[PDB]
Symmetry: D4
């Protein structure tokens, strides 16, 4: 490729020397049957739930899931086999080994075996990419609590005033980088967020109720 | 003053020519009895709930509440009567009228009558100032909803993929100015905010339970 | 209101003293029939195309369109008549006239006559608001042209090198304020933008082709 | 030099031990004949299209193209041979080898052989530098598509309103760093950009038509 | 002038119709004797401490102090009388009155009478300008106090941990505009600032001790 | 873990092979008795002040203090033993050694022995985290001194004007990064800061006087 | 227009009621003869140098120069007479007077009389606009001087070290707004700027020498 | 130290094993005689101009100059020998070798031999630090040239208008980082900068003329 491949992806390149045909075609069938929209760990669950497949195929299947995104980040208008040939040539140029017709044939044969089945996986990784493809996004947050006190011009007095200052901390991404953001509240606004969000939840319930022809994704 | 006084505050300066002693002292007593931490509209409610006071005093009482903050934003270490004299002189310098001993005496007499009672009101306006006295604060927010669609490289296909992209818009202040801030979500994170806020609410319940010697303010 | 009303909106308040019932109900009927999503000038066209209505109603109808947004920016969960009463009271407080039962009744009667018909107009102004309700938006742009020249270390030579440096200037809004933004190009990139935009246009053609149950807005 | 030379440039320093005179002078002749304004890959094409040159010269020729910019970024008012001597001394100071008269002579001889021919290449690299030498520049962009939906206060209704919100994403450089920039559109503005750009293209056609004495560069 | 003169400065232009020679020359003498570096209020004190001068001259003397800066912001290399003539012509162009030889002569005569004495005042206003002539400067600050509390994972426990978080707020100017700046502390750092500043104060004492030939300004 | 552990923390993992029970339980007892809120160096002092403990335990105790924060940064709602198991599994995945039941048992046994005692240490590290958990914080500052001079339009004169321009430099953190900030002063403002800070110090004295039930932390 | 016209431009609208034909055509001839690229004050000089024209025409001629830019900022592709008609209609809509055929005819007749001659003036105002049409531009600058002193750890020593720290202040515009920018120097760099600028000046001399067919503008 | 020492500074630590007393004391004498304010290359010149010193001492003398800054960046109030002991202990902690009394004694003996002579060098490095110790500073700049052309609405015309748009590019530092800054000019402003700078140069000449008791530094 024009990109450098560490063993996180080269592992498959090295391990592709034994895997056979029935197992790969059956896995393609299963993935076509697999509920589209699964995470890498979900694919690990699917693999571990196997009974017809050998344990050796697992060394790359989880990586194939990651390689799928690299395989499915590929441009659609570009020919699949031609792109495979180009990336194989570039990899051999900067790869760990010079490729003869034997390993080249095994690689490209398995590759076309894969892309022929990536409809579900193509859709899954398209879905995964898009949810982030905005200006900024979300990870997590907390809240804190204060009990600030009020000091008189007469320090000898008993201070007997109390407060509740909620705080909020959100975790959000821009340009593939993390940041912080802080803000101040009070009780009423808290209730108001809460009620508003609950009613939003009802709205999703209604939209879920409406469309039957579309199954809605729940990906993280 | 060094500050210019429009009729929002000069109205009292002009209207102070008739109000008598019993009404002002009784109002001071009531305010001392008034639950510390009331807003201007709450003071309007207290005034309208009156039965011993004349209607004429109302022309400034609501303004006295606003003048109280101007009266209670005053520096504590500075002598009350001396500060009154200085501000009266500066106002007469740039005010609507040159002050003789008559109006000056009425003004300063009523002033000392007021500051002698501003303990509750001093505390109230101190409280009001502080909650904002941070780097930034809060007014309001909304949410929206999208139903983005997914387009294939084969436009002739039925598009059958659906999404739910919540949006958030917060209203927050810096340097006495307003702004906006926008962000992206998904269902799980919504539930997570909701649960976290509910548990925060429980925390306030516990802290409320603990301290009996302090009555906690609920000011907006 | 809490907002001050100049004659851009007070004009209706002043002019509401003569308009009758048949004309207003017929205009409501027409607006219900009016293609939802029309601009103020489109409403002016609709008005000028009238034959059953008097010319006098025009003094506010165009303003009603603007007042509609102020009438339709109103919060939905708040009762229509109660909100009308509150805004009428606040306006009378700071308005040009104190309102008796006569003008108050005429105003509120016409108001409820209007809000009873604002479904199309509510939808229109919701639509108008939303397209802008993002982080930033668009007005206009240009391009320029340069013919920079290349100077040798030998100034006595004939300079015979030529260039074409397109420039771009976009007009965009943040926080209700305008700005500028500038950038550099070359021929290929120009062709590339052009082709990409044309293919986008085809995409809209396809989506337009798909959905028959939804009529898509073309508002500016 | 004062700059450190990795093998991307030191490779020539190491490989200069065999190349002969006829090949270098013929390559200088060819480059003088080479259409001024070629990229490194274009120079690679020119090299691979060779028939009189040995394959060994290629190890640095492509680097000479890159070294040319380092050789042609050099200040013009500074003497060529004196600058060569200074940079050779500094490199020997921090280089991979201490230079005797033999390698020093080979290096400086080849250097003066090169700079004697860099008129075309000097012009080319001047041209390459300048197009970027502004406040900010360009790489690429995309567009997206939305199909936002409109929700009533009556959720039980069929939502039948549709929209088309194009989006734009430009890739631009400041201070040798990349960024993003986002914006909102609608159909008309799209057509308007398109027509405006087409007419700009016509303008280049006219200017191309006018000047015959100047051949205009098309460099990327 | 090219600048517009309101009555803050036009007042002198209007009031210059009566003042005589002995008073102005004696005031020039006094100002030459006046301790260089006085503020406008200090000049007011000097004026009010007068016994030989008429009260009428005061209407502009305080403004002359302000006009002095406008008179001493003037460029030094430009001829004093020529600059006076130019500014008088421009003012008459956009002033409240067209100037004949009479008022023109009175104005310019008094002007040259003034600039002939502005050595002390020139130095004073130069001094005043410079202290601000940096990137940013100072007005004021405060501190606050917190008593944050520590909440356990076991809310039923008595919270018995205490803190002291000083805060700081500085007031500083850039581009003739004000801002804020906030920061966090603890006790040790407070002591450290305090000791460091005290030792700085000693340093000024030493430098004050050293130079006898220079009297150091204390201007605000 | 999901985080990589260098020998700053892996040292304990490697050294945990000999430490016994009485020493660890006695150290837990001591730490419970240790004044909550001690720094790593304070824990080193506590360790070196030992007489019942072996010297070998010291190899990790100081690291346990650092590991405590990593152990006490852990989420409270997550089960202690389950989190220990998860982190042990992940570490064994990317650790220096694959863990059998022997080292796993020793590790987890000691771990539960520790977390059973971390109340004081949990509170300490919570305290340590929080003081920084704001928008920005403090390290240090200096001051400088100038003796700027005043130059006349007559350079032949003796310059005899003197000044004192204090400067300030603060060291403050945002986003775990350092910066600078500079500002200008004069004598009065210096005195004013000094007096204000002294009076703040008195305020802490008063608050210290008030609450007896809470011991206030002095951590750096 | 869509823009509001104050008397800075409405003055011509009001004063156009007397001017005749010979004077306007002769002024058009003169302007065609006028050296293209003159400022408003240069046009004032040209007017005052008149002998065939009446003094009354001057009331707008200087404004015509300003109106020319408003007349020449007009879009070229739009028909001149049609644009005149549109702007006249809009002005009459929001102007000081409703226009009959008489004043409308006088206005439009004079307008077409003007635009028929604006070739020189069109070029002039195009030129004026462009020089600013970049990201930022220039007004002015200064320099200052320091004589900082060096303080020992032994304050009793004679300080005998001296420095020269030039400073620079530039005045530059972005988005039609002014700013500042500051920087630090030393003697050598000063000489270097000076020499570099002088050699640049020589470069302009050479380019001036080269092209005879083009007269270069010197506009401010 | 708390800082890590690479061989740029550890080289002296390793090479200090042979240097003798007479050479170091004579070099201290020479440096005391050396014109205070010399750069590292100036010290190299001084060293190479030696005749009494051995060549071996040169391996660190140039580094001593750099180590001097590290030796003279040291805090003045801290005891020299105590600081030496602390830094030696910390270095031995993280250094290349554990230090016995022999190398420790040689190191500390030479160290005290050095600091006893660093008055000139202390002053030099203080001077070096300060000139940069502002908000931002300077390296270099250029200028460019344009010959923009003016295009008519009638493209068939001969374009015969010419311009001269100087450009400026400055190189300046903030927070130890580099940047750019760009700006637009014209001929007059160029002359104006030039004249202003020349007159500034005269000002330095005058100040140089005035003070004889202070020798002014010229450091780069």
């Amino acid at each position: 490729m024009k990109y450098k491949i560490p063993k996180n992806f080269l592992s498959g390149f090295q391990i592709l020397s034994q895997l056979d045909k029935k197992e790969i075609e059956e896995l393609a069938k299963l993935l076509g049957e697999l509920p589209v929209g699964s995470n890498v760990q979900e694919f690990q669950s699917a693999i571990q739930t196997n009974k017809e497949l050998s344990e050796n195929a697992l060394k790359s299947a989880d990586t194939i899931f990651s390689l799928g995104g690299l395989l499915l980040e590929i441009k659609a208008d570009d020919s699949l086999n031609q792109v495979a040939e180009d990336l194989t040539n570039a990899y051999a140029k900067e790869g760990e080994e010079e490729i003869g017709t034997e390993q080249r044939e095994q690689l490209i044969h398995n590759l076309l075996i894969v892309l022929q089945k990536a409809e579900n996986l193509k859709k899954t990784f398209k879905a995964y990419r898009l949810l982030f493809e905005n200006t900024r996004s979300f990870r997590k947050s907390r809240v804190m609590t204060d009990m600030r006190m009020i000091f008189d011009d007469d320090f000898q007095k008993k201070n007997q005033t109390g407060l509740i200052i909620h705080q909020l901390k959100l975790e959000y991404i821009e340009d593939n980088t993390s940041k912080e953001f802080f803000i101040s509240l009070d009780n009423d606004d808290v209730l108001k967020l809460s009620e508003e969000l609950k009613r939003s939840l009802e709205k999703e319930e209604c939209i879920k109720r409406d469309f039957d022809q579309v199954q809605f994704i729940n990906i993280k």
